[PDB]
């Protein structure tokens, strides 16, 4: 769409009011011209054909309940873009300011969200297991990070490489949640999961075993479900990343924490410089160690903590 950039206002899934970047041309569209080649949000109108219609609104006010998921998808994509740019100096997912597209109201009662290789897609949930998935900034950022990984390391979606890919998305989804200071935690999906139950979440990075995911290499899942446990075995890496940041003692191994920022610098470097499509956990450890070495010196504490953390989860 060609038009005039403007700012609209609406309310997101959780009922919070926020301003969003729109474009005016007869209608007001969810098209943000302020970031790279643009952020565009589409209405999939409960169907599965994509992307759907670019979101159009008559008055630039988005307070209808049907508007909620669009407002958050649009807004959270902006935040995520900002995170990457400000923090890592990366312009969009491709490093070249590619447009970010998202569709909402995908299908009926769809309890999931995903990056399909070209764009983001968000279900509305069934209202019991989930509410519209774009209401979770960690979910939005987890999905957009899959695009970053696809353009960089290219980790295949299966077995260990796949679990690495998933862990990378949870790590950065959490870093973005802290960046925006939106009631941050080390849990994944807490804001849109089981609206009826408080205190739970989809996955825990601080304690993956809380929900039955492995927190040690010896406990990894070796079967075929979930593409070889990409969403299960990610727990091992997640735990490592939490320990590097926060510190702790895990299975008797003590880790001094070096904080979130360094965690992000180290993982971003590993991802973008050292990982390859078929990298395995042992390779990830070597990558993370080399990255910290690069950034902080081989005799640094940083390097030391990365080592301890992988030792703690049993990754050699």
Q: Active site includes 143? A: yes
233 vs 238 by CB, closer to Ca ion: 238
- What minimum distance in Å lies between the beta carbon of 56 and Zn ion? 30
172 vs 296 by CB, closer to Zn ion: 172
Residue 152 within binding range of Zn ion, rule CB under 5 A: no
Q: Active site includes 160? A: no
Give residues preceding each break in the chain, C–N over 2.5 A.
Answer: none
**Residue 169 interacting partner from Zn ion, Ca ion, none (CB closer than 5 to 8 Å by kind):** Zn ion
Residue 201 within binding range of Zn ion, rule CB under 5 A: no
Per the residue annotation, which of 74, 231, 250, 302 is the catalytic one?
231
**Residue 194 interacting partner from Zn ion, Ca ion, none (CB closer than 5 to 8 Å by kind):** Ca ion
Which of 17, 19, 61, 116 touches Ca ion by CB under 5 A? Answer: 61
- CA dist., res. 191 & res. 207, Å (int): 18
**Residue 37 interacting partner from Ca ion, Zn ion, none (CB closer than 5 to 8 Å by kind):** none
- What minimum distance in Å lies between the beta carbon of 287 and Zn ion? 19
275 vs 292 by CB, closer to Zn ion: 275
Which of 102, 169, 201, 305 touches Zn ion by CB under 5 A? Answer: 169
Whether 253 and 308 have beta carbons less than 8 Å apart is answered as yes
Per the residue annotation, which of 143, 160, 250, 302 is the catalytic one?
143
Residues near Zn ion (CB under 5 A)? 166, 169
Bind-site residues for Zn(2+): 142, 146, 166
The residues annotated as belonging to the active site are: 143, 231
């Amino acid at each position: 769409i060609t038009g005039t950039s403007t700012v609209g206002v609406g309310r997101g899934v959780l009922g919070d009011q926020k301003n969003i970047n729109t474009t005016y041309s007869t209608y007001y569209y969810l098209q943000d011209n302020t970031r790279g080649d643009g952020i565009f949000t589409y209405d999939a109108k409960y169907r599965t054909t994509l992307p759907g219609s670019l979101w159009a609104d008559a008055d630039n006010q988005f307070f209808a309940s049907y508007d909620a998921p669009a407002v958050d998808a649009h807004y959270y994509a902006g935040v995520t873009y900002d995170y990457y740019k400000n923090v890592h100096n990366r312009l969009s997912y491709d490093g070249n300011n590619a447009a970010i597209r998202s569709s909402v109201h995908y299908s009926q009662g769809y309890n999931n969200a995903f990056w399909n290789g070209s764009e983001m897609v968000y279900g509305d949930g069934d209202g019991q297991t989930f509410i519209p998935l774009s209401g979770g900034i960690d979910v939005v950022a987890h999905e957009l990070t899959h695009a970053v990984t696809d353009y960089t390391a290219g980790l295949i979606y299966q077995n260990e490489s796949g679990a690495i890919n998933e862990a990378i998305s949870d790590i950065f989804g959490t870093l973005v949640e802290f960046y925006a200071n939106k009631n941050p935690d080390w849990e994944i999906g807490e804001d849109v999961y089981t609206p009826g139950i408080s205190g739970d979440s989809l996955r825990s990075m601080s304690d993956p075993a809380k929900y039955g995911d492995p927190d040690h290499y010896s406990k990894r899942y070796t079967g075929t479900q979930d593409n070889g446990g990409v969403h299960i075995n990610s727990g091992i890496i997640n735990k490592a990343a939490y320990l590097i940041s926060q510190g702790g003692t895990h299975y008797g191994v003590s880790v001094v924490g070096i904080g979130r920022d360094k965690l992000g610098k180290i993982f971003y470097r590993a991802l973008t410089q050292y990982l390859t499509p078929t990298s395995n956990f042992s390779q990830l450890r070597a990558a993370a160690v080399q990255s910290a070495t690069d950034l902080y010196g081989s005799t640094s504490q940083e390097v030391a903590s990365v080592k301890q953390a992988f030792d703690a989860v049993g990754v050699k």
